[PDB]
Each structure stands twice: as structure tokens, then as C-alpha cells.
Chain A
Amino acid sequence: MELKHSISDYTEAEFLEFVKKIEDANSSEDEQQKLVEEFIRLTEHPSGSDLIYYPRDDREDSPEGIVKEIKEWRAANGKSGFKQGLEH
């Protein structure tokens, strides 16, 4: 693996894959807890695990909805965004 240091080492597509791994919830309970902990570390979003388990009504309860809220919140709070991939 090329190590991730922050969410800006993820393309949006890479981060969506990570959130889908969490939503798929195919991992052990211990691994699931460590994935959610890493999720919060990367997003720096003050909702923490609520983005996954207590989503706001005004977006999609889905990995796509989660990534959209993270993207918009981080941009509005002057935080670094996703790595641009070859879509750009």
C-alpha cells in the first residue's frame, strides 16, 4: 500500500470505495469499529459516526450521500479536498 496521511491522499472515488466497505459491513465487529474510527480521523467532521448511523434527512442515507456531505462541509470550512484523479 501507498500509505494515506490525510483524506487529501484519497480521490473522491477512492474515499467512496472506503465508505462502501463500511456500509457493506462484511468485516468483523472489531474491524468495523476500527474502520469507523479511521473514517472519523480522515473526515474531521464534527458529526463523527453520525454521518453513517444518524444521517440528516436532507441527503441520501448512502455512501454517496456521506461523501457529498463530507465534500461540501470540508470545502465550506477551508479544509483540504480530495486528490484530483484522471477524471479532472
Chain B
Amino acid sequence: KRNKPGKATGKGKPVGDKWLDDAGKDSGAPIPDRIADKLRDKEFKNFDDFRKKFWEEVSKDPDLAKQFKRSNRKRIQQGYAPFAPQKDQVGGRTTFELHHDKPISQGVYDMNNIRVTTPKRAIDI
């Protein structure tokens, strides 16, 4: 399903100054509502394709960009996922990941359902 193409849909959620503090929690972190507006109806070859445009939009949001230090800002500017804190990594999974809160319907592109998580939160892939 992550390798299948499709159309971005949904609203996202309002987000403050400690956005990815939620990434390791039960909920994970939501797609910021304003980021959600910029991706709606775009078509994606696979979920890896959505991931790149998402982090690019995050880098262009000053309120989100400043929640990262210099090296992570350079990554998201290039569409790469930021490094997660070392304690929140799992082996070679060093970077924040995009996952789904609830079952995907017949989907993977529903931005009400997409969560940013730490590798550790999503340890059992």
C-alpha cells in the first residue's frame, strides 16, 4: 500500500512550538493543518514521494523550521527527514518516519491519518 500511487486528502491539526515532542507518544505528531493545505489533491507515485514534498513544506514554515537546529534544517530544506534524537532511533532507522494512526481504507495519503513518529514509536515494522 505504501508503494501504491494515490491522491493526498484531509485537513491535519493545529500545531505549536514543540511539534515533534508528540512523535514518540501514543498519538505521534500530526500533519500541521497549514502544511496539509499545500499538499491536498497532489498525486504521488508512492509514499516515499509524499515524504519529500512534506519535509520541504516544513522547511518553508518559519515557526516549524526554527524547532530544528542547523543540521536538521539543512536536511528538511532538501526534503530529507530530520534525524530523530539518538534515544528514539532504532539501528539504521535514524530519522523521523511517516506512519498511519488508524487502518488505511480502500488511503495511505489521508493527512488526518498520517503521523510523524520516531523510529522507536514505530519499532515493530
A residues with a Cβ closer than 8 A to B are 23, 25, 29, 33, 36, 47-50, 52-55, 61-62
Contact = CB atoms under 8 A, between A and B. Distances in A.
Contacts of A54: 69, 83, 85-86
23 contacts: A23-B70, A25-B71, A29-B80, A33-B92, A33-B94, A36-B83, A36-B94, A47-B86, A48-B86, A49-B83, A49-B86, A49-B89, A50-B86, A52-B71, A52-B83, A53-B71, A53-B72, A53-B82, A54-B69, A54-B83, A54-B86, A61-B69, A62-B70
Contacts of A47: 86
Given A33-B92, A33-B94, A53 B80 contact: no
Nearest to A53: B83
Interface residues of B, number: 14
Nearest to A61: B70
Given A29-B80, A33-B94, A48-B86, A53 B74 contact: no
Given A25-B74, A49-B83, A55 B94 contact: no
Contacts, number: 35
B71 A23 contact: yes
Nearest to B75: A25
B72 to A, nearest CB: 5
A36 B94 CA distance: 10
A55 B70 CA distance: 9
Contacts of A29: 80
Given A33-B92, A36-B94, A50 B71 contact: no
Nearest to A51: B86
Contacts of B82: 53
* Residue of B71, B75, B82 with most partner-chain A CB within 10 A: B71
A36 B69 CA distance: 16
Contacts of B70: 23, 61-62
B86 A55 contact: no
Contacts of B89: 48-49
